[PDB]
Structure formats: C-alpha cells, structure tokens
Homo-oligomer: A and B are copies of this chain.
Amino acid sequence: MRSTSYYPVIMTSDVAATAAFYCQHFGFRPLFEADWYVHLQSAEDPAVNLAILDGQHSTIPAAGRGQVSGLILNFEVDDPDREYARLQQAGLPILLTLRDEGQRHFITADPNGVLIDIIKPI
C-alpha cells in the first residue's frame, strides 16, 4: 500500500532530458528533482514510479556504475492504438508497430534506448 515499495532506477548521463521525456509523453510528474537524481511518479497511479540517476554518481557502488541498456518498461493501457497515434505523431521512435500477439501492443523507446512496450491484454 506504500506507493513506492518497488520501482526501477535507470542510469543515464542525461538526467534532466530523460526526466522531461517521461513527463512529456508518459504521464509522469516529478516528486524529487536534482541534477543527479529525479524520482518520477505517474499522475494517475502513484504505484507507478521511475527514478532516473546519473550513472557515475559516487553514491552508486563503483561496480554498478554505468549506463542503462537491455531493459524494457512494460505499461498496460486500455487503448494502445490511440497511444501509438499520439506518440508516433510526436516523433518518438517506433521499434515495433501495433500487432496482436494475448497482448495487442507496440514498442517505442526513450532517448537512452530503453524500450517501452505499450500493451493491452487481449
């Protein structure tokens, strides 16, 4: 019931541009914003959180420092068709066009190359 009991933190060298991207296109707003760390939370569901971290910050154990890769963020939505139309027209990269699979979905990506899979259960 704590909204923040589980969430991912992605490492990037462009914290502010990454945060702005999720706020502009994916319904997030900032709960904490600094140059090295931003915690975002979905406006419509406080249980959906994403934190964005400078991947060389000294507070990350040295062995884990780096840059995000090999990651997909899955979001379930009621109308992936409408979301595709909005995002494609906003100029986001389309990595996989809409298709039926029990999911109808499409795949885009953030400026770090994190894949974003927008899915309706079918």
List residues of A whose CB falls within 8 A of some B CB.
2, 4-12, 42, 45, 47-48, 51, 53, 55, 60-61, 63-64, 66-76, 95-96, 107, 109, 112-113, 115, 117, 121
CA distance A104 to B7 in the complex (A): 17
In the complex, which of the residues B12, B47, B95 contacts A70, with contact meaning CB atoms closer than 8 Å? B12
* B55-A64 in contact (CB<8A): no
Number of identical monomers bound together in the oligomeric complex: 2
Choose among B5, B9, B74 the residue that contacts A6 (Cβ–Cβ < 8 A).
B74
Q: Which residues of B contact A47 (CB under 8 A)?
A: 6, 47
Asked if B95 contacts A63 (CB within 8 A), the reply is: yes
Known: A6-B48, A51-B74. 10 other contacts (CB 8 A): A4-B76, A6-B42, A6-B76, A8-B8, A9-B71, A10-B70, A51-B72, A63-B95, A63-B109, A63-B113
